Write an enzyme that holds these catalytic residues in place. Structure first.
Site, PDB file in Angstrom:
ATOM      1  N   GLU A  69      -9.526   1.041   8.553  1.00 51.93           N
ATOM      2  CA  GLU A  69      -9.910   1.069   6.963  1.00 51.93           C
ATOM      3  C   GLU A  69      -9.185  -1.288   6.776  1.00 51.93           C
ATOM      4  O   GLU A  69     -10.744  -1.459   6.092  1.00 51.93           O
ATOM      5  CB  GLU A  69      -8.447   1.981   6.448  1.00 51.93           C
ATOM      6  N   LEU A 121       0.617  -1.389  -0.083  1.00 48.01           N
ATOM      7  CA  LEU A 121       0.178  -0.360   0.060  1.00 48.01           C
ATOM      8  C   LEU A 121       1.227   1.342  -0.197  1.00 48.01           C
ATOM      9  O   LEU A 121       2.115   1.551   0.659  1.00 48.01           O
ATOM     10  CB  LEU A 121      -0.787   0.066   0.828  1.00 48.01           C
TER      11      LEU A 121
HETATM   12  N1  LIG Z   1      -5.122  -0.278  -2.349  1.00 46.64           N
HETATM   13  C1  LIG Z   1      -6.100  -1.220  -2.307  1.00 46.64           C
HETATM   14  O1  LIG Z   1      -6.983  -1.442  -1.632  1.00 46.64           O
HETATM   15  C2  LIG Z   1      -5.314  -2.638  -3.250  1.00 46.64           C
HETATM   16  C3  LIG Z   1      -4.259  -1.938  -3.891  1.00 46.64           C
HETATM   17  N2  LIG Z   1      -3.624  -2.773  -4.230  1.00 46.64           N
HETATM   18  C4  LIG Z   1      -1.845  -2.879  -4.972  1.00 46.64           C
HETATM   19  O2  LIG Z   1      -2.105  -3.657  -6.138  1.00 46.64           O
HETATM   20  C5  LIG Z   1      -0.937  -3.394  -6.608  1.00 46.64           C
HETATM   21  C6  LIG Z   1      -0.587  -4.716  -7.645  1.00 46.64           C
HETATM   22  O3  LIG Z   1      -1.742  -4.806  -8.873  1.00 46.64           O
HETATM   23  P1  LIG Z   1      -1.254  -4.928  -9.981  1.00 46.64           P
HETATM   24  O4  LIG Z   1      -0.443  -4.532 -10.316  1.00 46.64           O
HETATM   25  O5  LIG Z   1      -2.672  -3.855 -10.170  1.00 46.64           O
HETATM   26  O6  LIG Z   1      -2.441  -6.697 -10.315  1.00 46.64           O
HETATM   27  P2  LIG Z   1      -3.181  -7.143 -10.593  1.00 46.64           P
HETATM   28  O7  LIG Z   1      -4.254  -6.954 -10.294  1.00 46.64           O
HETATM   29  O8  LIG Z   1      -3.786  -6.911 -12.255  1.00 46.64           O
HETATM   30  O9  LIG Z   1      -2.921  -8.620 -10.846  1.00 46.64           O
HETATM   31  C7  LIG Z   1      -2.864  -9.100 -12.073  1.00 46.64           C
HETATM   32  C8  LIG Z   1      -1.917 -10.585 -11.601  1.00 46.64           C
HETATM   33  O10 LIG Z   1      -2.750 -11.529 -11.574  1.00 46.64           O
HETATM   34  C9  LIG Z   1      -2.638 -12.384 -12.890  1.00 46.64           C
HETATM   35  N3  LIG Z   1      -3.817 -11.232 -13.592  1.00 46.64           N
HETATM   36  C10 LIG Z   1      -3.442  -9.427 -13.945  1.00 46.64           C
HETATM   37  N4  LIG Z   1      -4.442  -9.654 -14.487  1.00 46.64           N
HETATM   38  C11 LIG Z   1      -5.171 -10.864 -14.572  1.00 46.64           C
HETATM   39  C12 LIG Z   1      -6.448 -11.172 -15.193  1.00 46.64           C
HETATM   40  N5  LIG Z   1      -6.881 -10.227 -15.890  1.00 46.64           N
HETATM   41  N6  LIG Z   1      -7.619 -12.396 -15.341  1.00 46.64           N
HETATM   42  C13 LIG Z   1      -6.608 -13.607 -14.676  1.00 46.64           C
HETATM   43  N7  LIG Z   1      -5.192 -13.218 -14.231  1.00 46.64           N
HETATM   44  C14 LIG Z   1      -4.915 -11.943 -14.212  1.00 46.64           C
HETATM   45  C15 LIG Z   1      -1.026 -11.670 -13.708  1.00 46.64           C
HETATM   46  O11 LIG Z   1      -0.839 -11.111 -15.506  1.00 46.64           O
HETATM   47  P3  LIG Z   1      -0.635 -12.754 -15.953  1.00 46.64           P
HETATM   48  O12 LIG Z   1      -2.073 -12.988 -16.872  1.00 46.64           O
HETATM   49  O13 LIG Z   1       0.109 -12.316 -17.010  1.00 46.64           O
HETATM   50  O14 LIG Z   1      -0.354 -13.907 -15.681  1.00 46.64           O
HETATM   51  C16 LIG Z   1      -0.837 -11.172 -12.424  1.00 46.64           C
HETATM   52  O15 LIG Z   1       0.244 -11.243 -12.054  1.00 46.64           O
HETATM   53  C17 LIG Z   1      -0.079  -4.321  -5.159  1.00 46.64           C
HETATM   54  O16 LIG Z   1       1.272  -3.848  -4.912  1.00 46.64           O
HETATM   55  C18 LIG Z   1      -0.991  -3.786  -4.089  1.00 46.64           C
HETATM   56  O17 LIG Z   1      -0.425  -2.978  -3.809  1.00 46.64           O
HETATM   57  C19 LIG Z   1      -4.273  -4.173  -4.610  1.00 46.64           C
HETATM   58  C20 LIG Z   1      -5.925  -4.717  -3.748  1.00 46.64           C
HETATM   59  C21 LIG Z   1      -6.031  -3.715  -3.039  1.00 46.64           C
HETATM   60  C1  LIG Z   2      -3.915  -9.544  10.790  1.00 44.70           C
HETATM   61  C2  LIG Z   2      -3.225  -8.650  11.358  1.00 44.70           C
HETATM   62  O1  LIG Z   2      -2.676  -7.596  10.667  1.00 44.70           O
HETATM   63  C3  LIG Z   2      -2.536  -7.713   9.669  1.00 44.70           C
HETATM   64  O2  LIG Z   2      -1.486  -8.713  10.007  1.00 44.70           O
HETATM   65  C4  LIG Z   2      -3.043  -6.952   8.600  1.00 44.70           C
HETATM   66  C5  LIG Z   2      -1.980  -6.298   7.208  1.00 44.70           C
HETATM   67  C6  LIG Z   2      -2.941  -6.257   5.948  1.00 44.70           C
HETATM   68  C7  LIG Z   2      -2.108  -5.721   4.613  1.00 44.70           C
HETATM   69  O3  LIG Z   2      -2.987  -6.048   3.596  1.00 44.70           O
HETATM   70  C8  LIG Z   2      -3.152  -5.324   2.068  1.00 44.70           C
HETATM   71  C9  LIG Z   2      -1.852  -5.323   1.875  1.00 44.70           C
HETATM   72  C10 LIG Z   2      -1.476  -4.877   0.343  1.00 44.70           C
HETATM   73  C11 LIG Z   2      -2.266  -5.301  -0.262  1.00 44.70           C
HETATM   74  O4  LIG Z   2      -1.723  -4.953  -1.914  1.00 44.70           O
HETATM   75  C12 LIG Z   2      -0.889  -3.993  -2.918  1.00 44.70           C
HETATM   76  C13 LIG Z   2      -3.235  -5.606  -0.097  1.00 44.70           C
HETATM   77  C14 LIG Z   2      -3.864  -5.611   1.340  1.00 44.70           C
HETATM   78  C15 LIG Z   2      -5.725  -6.457   1.533  1.00 44.70           C
HETATM   79  C16 LIG Z   2      -6.797  -5.176   2.043  1.00 44.70           C
HETATM   80  C17 LIG Z   2      -6.070  -4.355   2.390  1.00 44.70           C
HETATM   81  N1  LIG Z   2      -6.810  -2.904   2.788  1.00 44.70           N
HETATM   82  C18 LIG Z   2      -8.175  -2.463   1.622  1.00 44.70           C
HETATM   83  N2  LIG Z   2      -8.888  -1.551   1.857  1.00 44.70           N
HETATM   84  C19 LIG Z   2      -9.656  -1.853   0.255  1.00 44.70           C
HETATM   85  N3  LIG Z   2     -11.151  -0.616   1.106  1.00 44.70           N
HETATM   86  N4  LIG Z   2      -9.769  -2.298  -0.117  1.00 44.70           N
HETATM   87  C20 LIG Z   2      -9.455  -3.366  -0.511  1.00 44.70           C
HETATM   88  N5  LIG Z   2      -9.218  -4.555  -1.722  1.00 44.70           N
HETATM   89  C21 LIG Z   2      -7.829  -3.863   0.114  1.00 44.70           C
HETATM   90  C22 LIG Z   2      -6.802  -4.588   0.646  1.00 44.70           C
HETATM   91  C23 LIG Z   2      -7.623  -5.947  -1.027  1.00 44.70           C
END
Ligand SMILES: NC(=O)C1=CN([C@@H]2O[C@H](COP(=O)(O)OP(=O)(O)OC[C@H]3O[C@@H](n4cnc5c(N)ncnc54)[C@@H](OP(=O)(O)O)[C@@H]3O)[C@@H](O)[C@H]2O)C=CC1
Ligand SMILES: CCOC(=O)CCCCOc1ccc(OC)cc1Cc1cnc2nc(N)nc(N)c2c1C
Length: 186
Positions: A30, A22
């Protein structure tokens, strides 16, 4: 199977990730909100399914995967089987959604939640149909290398209230944020 939903937390500059983590320091309430919203199922005998890209799976700390009380499905075209700890693997978002309909799962899945990352969000958001976006607005800029797709406000209506979602400004570690819910139907 019930509703399709995305959930995400996003900075003012539309950032969601940096270097596989993140952009902001951990916001523990959150994360509890994310857990509660995606785990809670409004139907007895069923659980919710979470769909995520491969990078998102590995971005979640090991102790917290699989996301408990939810069916975990990972998307990848490279993997040959679900990662250690995950439940399902699909090769496209269409495939994952069809699978929820198969008899293996048709009876067991309530809500579906897309929980990251960018590509998966974009494809879901631009696909015709009924879709909600649960968006936490982190009210500061954070340096990011991965961004949330554009929300088209012509299609996605910001809801004026939603049960179970606080409307006022939250703050943890000196970072203000607020919860939003958007809905389209097209
Ligand atoms: N702030 C938030 O709420 C959240 C933030 N994140 C952030 O997202 C970042 C990475 O996400 P991002 O780069 O978008 O990766 P994606 O969400 O695109 O995940 C895709 C991964 O799985 C496979 N994949 C990708 N796209 C598809 C698809 N359309 N269908 C099936 N498989 C797929 C791999 O691609 P391939 O098809 O080549 O195998 C790829 O490694 C993380 O660093 C995390 O911090 C994640 C969740 C929540
Ligand atoms: C329980 C012990 O406590 C712990 O150890 C807590 C570990 C927490 C780490 O979680 C990660 C970290 C990196 C990361 O992605 C780069 C995703 C997530 C999971 C997460 C967290 N907040 C989210 N928020 C929203 N709104 N939407 C989401 N989809 C969401 C998601 C998917």
């Amino acid at each position: 199977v019930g509703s399709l939903n995305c959930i995400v937390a996003v900075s003012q500059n539309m950032g969601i990730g940096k270097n596989g983590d993140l952009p902001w320091p951990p916001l523990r309430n959150e994360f509890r909100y994310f857990q509660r919203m995606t785990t809670t199922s409004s139907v007895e005998g069923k659980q919710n399914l979470v769909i995520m890209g491969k990078k998102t799976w590995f971005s979640i700390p090991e102790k917290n995967r699989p996301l408990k009380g939810r069916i975990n499905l990972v998307l990848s075209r490279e993997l040959k089987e679900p990662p250690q700890g995950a439940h399902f693997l699909s090769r496209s978002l269409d495939d994952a959604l069809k699978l929820t309909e198969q008899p293996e799962l048709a009876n067991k899945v309530d809500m579906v939640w897309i929980v990251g990352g960018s590509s998966v969000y974009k494809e879901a958001m631009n696909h015709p149909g009924h879709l909600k976006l649960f968006v936490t607005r982190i009210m500061q800029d954070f340096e990011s290398d991965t961004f949330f797709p554009e929300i088209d406000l012509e299609k996605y209506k910001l809801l004026p209230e939603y049960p179970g979602v606080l409307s006022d400004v939250q703050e943890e570690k000196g970072i203000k944020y607020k919860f939003e819910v958007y809905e389209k139907n097209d």
